Scaffold this active site. Structure first.
Site: not given
Length: 107
Positions: A26, A36-37, A56, A82, A99
């Site tokens: 991912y 962010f990731d 999530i 979130y 994503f």
């Protein structure tokens, strides 16, 4: 609202089921923002199973709508990840999540 835009190639048939542990490279992205990731950085491709609500809700539905070799593009609503709370310091409240998801799994 999980919106899929798939980079095509793969098989299109091997779908994730319950009790199956699947492997995803991912890559996160904020809408109108930066990364962010990224699972590409740690090079540990996040072995996780399906049916335990580990991830999530937006990533959970979009993971099932892929197959082996495919490469989708999530677009998650705020209320499924979130958007009420916001992950502290990492995700602001009322955020929309993007994503890059590739399913190269087993089982």
């Amino acid at each position: 609202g999980v919106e899929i835009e798939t980079i095509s190639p793969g098989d299109g048939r091997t779908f994730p089921k319950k009790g199956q542990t699947c492997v995803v490279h991912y890559t996160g992205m904020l809408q109108n923002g930066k990364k962010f990731d990224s699972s590409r950085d740690r090079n540990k491709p996040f072995k996780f199973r399906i049916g335990k609500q580990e991830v999530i809700k937006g990533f959970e539905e979009g993971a099932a709508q892929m197959s082996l070799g495919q490469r989708a593009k999530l677009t998650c609503t705020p209320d499924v990840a979130y958007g009420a709370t916001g992950h502290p310091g990492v995700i602001p409240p009322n955020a929309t999540l993007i994503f890059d998801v590739e399913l190269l799994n087993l089982e």
